[model samples]
Target: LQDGPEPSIHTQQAYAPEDDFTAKWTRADARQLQRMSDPTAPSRENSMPASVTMPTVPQDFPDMSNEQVWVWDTWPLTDEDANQYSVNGWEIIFSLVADRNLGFDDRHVFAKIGYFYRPAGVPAAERPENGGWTYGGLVFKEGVTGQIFEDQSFSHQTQWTGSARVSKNGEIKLFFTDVAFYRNSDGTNIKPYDPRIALSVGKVKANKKGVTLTGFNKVTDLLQADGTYYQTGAQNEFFNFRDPFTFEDPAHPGETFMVFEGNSAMQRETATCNEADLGYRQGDPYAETVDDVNASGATYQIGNVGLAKAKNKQLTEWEFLPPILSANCVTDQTERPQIYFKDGKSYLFTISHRGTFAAGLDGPEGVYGFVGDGIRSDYQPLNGGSGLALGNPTNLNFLGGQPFAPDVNQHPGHFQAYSHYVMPGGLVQSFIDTIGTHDDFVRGGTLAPTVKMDIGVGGDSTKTAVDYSYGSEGLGGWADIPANKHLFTNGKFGVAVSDEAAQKIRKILGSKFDDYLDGKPVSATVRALIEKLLAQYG
Candidate 1:
C-alpha cells in the first residue's frame, strides 16, 4: 500500500510536499511513459513506461523439488561495517530466513500483510502468549548453500523480515518488526494492531562450533511510529511500521540510519469522493467501487519508506525523520523498503502488489525502485519513469493471485515471485510463490531465481535479467568486482568466478568484466577466460 508523491516538473501537475525530505512516486510518474520494449511482453497490459522493463525468465520454469525449507520474507545477512573493504563492495551474501509454509496462503495473506500475515487463531498455542509457532527466524547459510541454522534463540513473536549488520569487531545487530502480541484464551496470540520496529544484538564467532552467533542477546523493542510524520497503528485504521534496515550514515559517521516500511500520518487533506481519485476497492475485490470509498475511507493509503537516525552507536535507539519516498495517491504498502548506494547515488526500492494499487491505476507485483542523490533527497523512478526493476510475468488481479493474468491468457506469467530484495552489485533475491494456472498453481518454497540489475550510468535507466541457472543452493559466491575479479567465490554454482586468476581475467575480458559474470552475452568470454586462466593460475 503506497501513497503520497509530488509531481516532477516533467509531469503535468505539481504536487506540493509537507517537508523537504518527503520524496514521491506519483501516479503521473507511472502514467508519464509507456514501455514498448517488447510489444508482445506480458507486462504490456499494466502500461509500463518505456523507461522501466521486466527481466526475462524462462516460460517453462522448473520446480524446487530438492530444496530444504519453504521460506519467505528474506533479508541479507550483511556486514554494514564492511562497505569500505573493497571497490565494488562485497559480493557474497547470507540471509535471515522465515518459515511460513503454505506458499498458497502467502498470496492470501500478503494482500494486507503489513498489518499482519498470521492467520487469526493459528492452531499452535505452545507459545501462544508470544506467537506460538508463528514468526521466529532461521539463517540460510551462504557457502553451505541450503544449510539451515535453527537457532533456538531466533524463536519469537513477529520476527518477520529480520535484517542484520555485523560490525568490524564481529558484533551482529539484528533488526525486525515486532507486533505487540495479545494472548487469547487457548494460549493463541491475536494480531493486535500495534506493531513496532525492534532490535537484537549478538556476537558472531567461529571455532569448534563453526560460524554462529555466540553472545546472542534478548530481543528489544526499538522504535515506533512518531505520530507526526508517520501514522501510528492505534490512531490510523490502515497502518504499519516495520522492516527496519540498519545502515551507517555516510554523512554522519558513528551515527546510524534505518530505512523501513511505514504509512504517512493521516488527517485533514484533499477530500475526494471521485470514483478514480478515491482509488476504490483499490475495489480489488470487484465488489467495492469508487462510491464505496470516500475521503474518510481511503485517506490513509499513503505508503512510505520511513527514515530514522540512531541516537547513538549502541543502535538501540533511533529518531524518525521524514520519509524519503511516499506514494500518496498511487498505491499502498511499499513493503520492505531498502536502499543501495553506489556510483554516488542512492537506489531506493520497495515491493508492492498490483492489488494494492489505487483506483484506475495498476502495476504488477515486483520490485519498484527510485534514484536519488542521498537517503533523504528527491527520488525518481528508474528506467526513465517505469521504476520497474524486476516484474512478475503476469499482472494478475485474480483474487487467488497466481501468476496468470487476464490479458496474457498464457501458461507462464510474472506472479512467480514476490518479496524481491536487491543487495550490492544489483543482485536481487525473493521467494517464489504461486505460478502456472489458477487451479494448477506451482508454489515455490525456496529462493527464486537470482536476478542481476543493470542501472544506467546516468542513473535514469535500468533493466533486470535472470540467471536461470542459479537457485537456492550455495547461496554465497565471489563477486566479479574489479577488486575481487581474480578471487571469485568460495563456493561455485555451475559456472563460477575466481580470484585464483586475477590478472589473466582482466587481460581477457577487459572492461566487460561484470558483463561476463552476469551472463550478459559474455558467457563465452567467461569460459574462455577460465579455460586459459586455469592453464596458468592452476
Candidate 2:
C-alpha cells in the first residue's frame, strides 16, 4: 500500500472501505454537475409533476442593509433545532455579518434579525424562499444583537459561519469559528486569521426583555483536523477547518455529529501528480499548473467535508470520523456543510465558490447536495448527478487577482449572492453579495429570497431541482417541515426501533452493525430486518 494519509487512497474508487463515510467528488462526476441554461426554468419529466428547476437568483427580496456588517452567512434562531428550522409564527435570523468598515471579509460577528419575517399569505407551497414575506420586524422576543458570543482570547473580527441551536427548554449552543489573528501594524482585512471551530454553551431567556443567551460558558476550542485524516499544521495559504454544524442523527439517540469544511491532507506523500484526479482534466484548459502556481494537479485543490461524532449530546467534545465527502482534485472548498433527514434518508449539502474549482473544472457559486442512505452511506450528487442544488446564475471569484483563496477582493465578478444555509424541506437561505456588474456591483447584505429545493419528490430520490414558488402549494416555510424529528409508526426518528423490537434487532446487529456499516453483510426475516435496519439507520 502506498503510505500517505490515513485512508492511503490513490484513486477515486473508494468511500469507507475506501475511507468510511468519505465519498469522493470524483473527476468524472464533477463534469456532470448542473449548469442550467435557465435555472428558474422547470422540467417536466416523464413522471407526474416531476422535478422543478430552482432559480439560482431570488426573483425578489428585502434590502436588509445595515451600516454595521455585510450579512453573508445567515441561520435562523431555532427551537427544537432538528437540522436547522425556523420557529413558527414570527421568525428571526442571525448572520455572520461583515462590513466595508472591515474591508468586507470573513472577519465579522454574529448579528440579529437582519431580516425578520413572517409566514406569507400566499400559501407555503408556491413560495420561493417564500419570496414575499413581511420583513423588517422588531426584535423584541427570541432575538439577539451585537456579538452574540465573544471572547477576549481571540480577535474580535471573528465569528465566521457560526450556528446556534436552541433546545426545547431553551438551552442554546453557539458554534463559532474563532480566529487567532494579528495585523500587519496597520488595520487591514486580508490577513492570516487562522480559524478554530469553537463552542459556547448557554441558554435562551425571554421575559418581555427580548431573548438573549445567558449563563454561557466561556468560549472553548473543539478538535482540529488530525493531520492524519485531514489537513493540519500551519495553514500557510488558504485556511479551512471552519463552519462547524452539529446535527443529531435520527439513527443514534443522544448521539450527535458535526460536519465542517476540510481539505485533502496527504498531498506531499500521495497527491504529487497522481492519476486519481490529474488524468481527469490533464489536457483541458489549464491543467498541470493554474495561474503560475503548482495547483492544477496539486493536492491543494482537494476540499472535503468532515464528520465528527460528539462525546455526548452536550456537544462539548467530539471524535473525528473520516470525511463524509471529498472534492479531491475537483474543487478546494465545501463550505458551510449541512445535513437534512427526510423519509429515512440523509442529505448532505455544502456551499462552494467558483475560484475553488481545480484547473479546468468549473461551476457556479452555489449550494451543492448529495443523497445517502445514512450519514455514513455513499453519497450520490443531487439533481440527477449534478451536485448543484442552488447557485448564482453567474460565477464569481474574490479570492485572487487571478483566482483561488488567501487573496481577498482581488478577483471580483457579477456574482449575485452566496453563503447558503439549507433548512428542512429543501429550503435554502443565502445572503446577497455583489450583484449587477463588477465595477457597478451592488453589495447586498440581507438574506436573498429563499430558494425551495424539490428533491427526491418523484420515483427517484437522487433527482433534485429548485422551486421558486413561495410555498403556494402549501409546502414551504417552517410549516412545510418540522424542526423535530418525524414520528415513525414504531418510534421517533433516531429511535425508530421500539424498545421491544430494538433488543431483538440489536442481538442480530450485534457485531454486524459495524460490518454492515462498513459495507462488509446477513437471514430471511432476520436477514431482512437486519438489512433494513442497517440500511435505514446506518
Candidate 3:
C-alpha cells in the first residue's frame, strides 16, 4: 500500500524553507534511515540513538487535518476458517510494554491489541454471526528488511481493549477488560453483565527455538484498594470499566500505574434540562437518558480517564486514584486512555468518535492529548480547548483516490487513531481506524498503516505541534483496497462487499441504519432493503 499522499507541510516564516536548520534536520533524518537500512549495521542491540532532534516546521507539519494511511495485511481474522475478519485500527503497544527476556530488542517486537469478531460458520459452538472477540498478539519486525511475523495468542471471548506491560523482574503482565460474565472452565460464559479489569501473568522465553510466552494464567480481577470495582457512582450505569493500560510510574521507582477508560455522572446542575419529553427527567436522578450523558442536557454518559496504582510492587493489588481527566466535553466513554513521558513531561492521550460531543467543542474526531508536569498533575491540552492533537482526514475520495459513482455520496468516515506510543526519533505511532462513512458506530474496516507523528513545541504557553511525516515506512505487506468496496457492513461480521446495494441502504436509512444495526426499529424502507439484501446475499 502506497502512503496515501504527502502530508501538507507548513512552517512559520521566521526561517526560510531552505534554511540550514531545515536542511540539517532533513539530513539527520535521512542518515538515520540509512543506518536503519544498512545490512552491515550491528546486530539488534540497543541500536536506537540516544537523542535526536526534530527540525522545526513553520506550520504543524504534515497537518494530518485530513490524511489517512492503511496498514498492510494487519487485518485480524474474524473467523480463521472462513477467511473473514473486519478491519479497523484498534489499540497497539510496543515491546517496551514487556521485558526483553525474549532476547529480541524492544524496537523489533511489539503487540497489537484490539477488538474483532467471529461469524457463525462450520465451527461447532461459535457465537452466531456478529459475536465479538478481543485479541492481542506479538508482531515481530526484525532488521531493516521490514519482515513482519504475527503470533496470535492473547484473546478473550468478549469485545474490549487491553494493554501489556513488563515488570522489572522480567515478568510479562497483561491487563485486559473483562466485559460481562466470568467464563466457565471450558471458556463459555457463566454469568451475566459485569465489566471489570482482569489480569494475567506470563513469561517470555527465548533461545535457538525462537521466542515464546509461557506460564500464562489468569491471576486476579483488579479493584480499588478498598476492594470495590471502579464505577461512575451512578445508578443503573452501562458498562464502563475497560481499556486497561499499564505503565511504569514515573513519579515512583519499582512501581507501576494502570490508567483505564472510566465514566463519571454529570453534576446534577448540569444534568437537568427543561426538555422533559426529550428524556431529561429533572428530578429523577437515576433515569436512563443517553448512552453517554453530557452536561449540556445530552443524555449520553460522558467518561474520563481513571488511574490506579499497584501496592508495593504487587501488580494485582491496586488502589484507585482520583480521576486524572474527565469528560466535560466529548463522549461519555473516553476510550483507550494511555500515559507516556517526553522531555520530563507526562502526556495523557485518548480517542473519541464524532457524535460524542456538541458541534465544534471537541474539534474533528480523532486522538486528543493533554500534557502535565507530573504523572499525577493537572494536564492542560497540548493545543487549546478540547486538546485535539490529531484530527481525522475528511472527504476521502475512494480506495485509490477514485471518484465516487454519481449516485453515491462518498463519506470518508470518521478517522480515529487508537492506542499510541513513542517510537525512536521522538515519533509517536498508532494504527488509524476509519469508521465507515455510512455508519455511526465503528464497524471495522481496513487497518490503516502505522502513522508516525512528530511532536514539537509550537508557540507560547507550551503549545505542541504534530507532524505526519513518517507514515510510509510501515506499509510492507497489504495491497491497495479497491474502490466501491463497502469497508464496513453494519451488523455483518467478517464480510467485505463491493457494490452499490449496501450504499443504497445506508443512504435510504441514514441514522435509522445505525439504529437497525443496534437491533432497534427502522422505517419500512430500511427493513425492506435490509431483508432484500440479506436474502440476496445469505
Candidate 4:
C-alpha cells in the first residue's frame, strides 16, 4: 500500500484492512420520556392515514446536476466546559437541493468534518495542547475582525468557528460555534458579567459581576480573567468548548438563523438557540474562493443590531452578528448546531450534556440535541427537558442507520455535528460522530448519513435520487462517482452512506460469488442469488 499520512490531506487515499483499532466505549444509559401522550397508542390500522406511503421523490425538480453542495469540518472543540477535544475531528453533513426554492428532489451527503490536521509541518504529537482544529462555521473574512473581534485584546477570542444560515431578505444568523474565555495558571476562567472589574482586563473594576476585571477594550483582555472569577476542575484544559449550529430562517426568507450554546467547568450553559437577522446577496460576480471570507476586514457589524454582516456572496469580510433574543443558560454544555424549517417557522437544534459514559464507567460523554427552539428565545427540548432521553427524544446514532439497518446509532467522542442539503418540502437530518480526546485538538474517522426530516405534515415517501460517491478522507480528498459526480461539484456532500456504497455498485448488485469480498459474508437473503450468478458465469 502507498504509505503517507494515515489519512492524507492531499491526494486520494483508501484505507486498507490494516489500521489502528481504537477502543469503542459504550455510552451512558439515560432515560427519556415522551413530551406528548400517545393517548390512543394509535393502532397501526387506525393510525395508517390514507396518505401513508413509503418515502418517495418529489416532482417538478430542477436538473439534479445543478445542485449546491459544500463541506464543513469540525476541529478544536471550544466550549466553556472542559471536555471536548479541541484537535479531534467532527462530523459534517451536506445536502443537495433542486434549487433555493425549497422544492422537492433534494439530496443529502454525510462525511467526517475534516480540518487542517497538519500546520507548519508540526507533527500531531508535538502540536500545542489545546490548539483547536478547523471545524464549525463558514465565515467571510471581510466581516471578520480576525483573531479578535473589533476589540483588540481578545487574543483567542476569534479561535472559534461557526456556521451562518440566511433568510430570504438577506438576514443572517450564526450557529455551530462554541465560546471559551480566559483561564488562569491555577485553572479557572474569568466571568463574563463580572461587576467589580472589566472582563477584558484582570484588574479589579466595577462591572456586572462583583470585583471583576476592567475593560482594556480588547476581546483578548476580557477573556483572560479566569482565576479572579470561576474555578476550573477536571476538564480544566483550554481545549474544552463547543461550536454553534446555524442555518437560514424560512418564514422570513433572505435572513439567517442559528443554534448556539456554551459549557463551563463540568456543567453546560445553553443559549436561547434563537434565530438572528442577517443580510445576503446572490450574484457571485467576483469569482471568489470560499477562503476569501477568512481574510480580515471582510465583514462589518450592524450599528443597530450589533450582528455581523457580509459584504457580498464572496464573503470576503464580516462584522459582529448577535442572536435575536436575550437568553441565559448554564445547565449543560451544548454542541454541534443544526437548523431546519417546518410549518413556515425555523428551528435551531443542538446536542447537550455535562458529559456521559457507559454504566459503571467514569469518563466523558454528551447528549445530542437536548435543546431546540422556534427561534433563539423560544427554546424547548427535543425530548421535553435537558439531558439524554431515550426512545422518543433519542439522540441520533450512526449514519444510514446502523451498519446494515435503518436506525441511527451512537458513537463516542468529544465532539459531534450534523449537516444537510437545503431542499424543499421535508428535511433530511444527518448525524456525525467524532472520536478522540481534548476539545481544541483531536482526530478520528467519521460516518455521516442523511435521514428524512419530519416536517410535521406527513413527509414525502417514494424513491430518493441514488447519487453517490467516495474519495480519500480529509483535505484534497478525491471523489469517485459514476461519472465525476462527487458532492463538491454542487456543494452537496456529507450524507450518511453514498448510494454507490449502499447499493454495492462496486460489485454486481445480484451477482452470486464468494460469500465475502472484504472478509464479511454477504447477507443470507442474497447468498443464493450470488451463487446462481457465479455458477452461470463459471
Query: After superposition, which runs of candidate 2 have C-alpha atoms over 4 Å from their true positions?
Result: 1-21, 34-61, 65-68, 78-90, 99-157, 185-192, 235-237, 267-270, 273-295, 395-414, 471-538
Model 2 lDDT tens row, 1-538: 1111111122212233224556766555555542233334322111111233234343244455434345567666543334433221223345554444654443343222233333312344555443433334322232122133343333333545667775534445777676545444354534444567777666433321233334544666786666767776444345477888877776665767788888766644345334444323434442333223244453567788888888875778888888878876778788888878777778888888766877655666677888877776667776535576765554222222221122233223325557777676667666666643324335566566555776686767777766645544312332122232211111111222223343354455554443332223333464456556634532
Count of clashes in candidate 2: 27
True lDDT of residue 421, candidate 2: 75
Residue by residue across 134-202, what tens digits does model 1's lDDT show? 222343222221112222222123445647664434455667765543446554434334566777666
Question: Alpha-carbon error at 418 in model 1, in Å?
Answer: 1.8
Best by TM-score: 2
Whole-model lDDT, model 2: 0.53
Question: How much lDDT does each candidate structure score?
Answer: 0.50, 0.53, 0.38, 0.24
Local accuracy of candidate 4 as per-residue lDDT tens digits, 105-128: 111111111122212123334543
Q: Give the TM-score of candidate 1.
A: 0.64
Candidate 2 or 1, higher lDDT = 2
Assess candidate 1 and give its lDDT. 0.50
Error of 1 at 483 (Å): 13
TM-score (all chains, Cα) for each model? 0.64, 0.67, 0.49, 0.31
Instruction: Give the lDDT of residue 476 in candidate 2.
Output: 34
Q: In what order do the candidates fall by lDDT, top score first?
A: 2, 1, 3, 4
Clashes of 4: 170
- Candidate with the larger TM-score of 2 and 3: 2
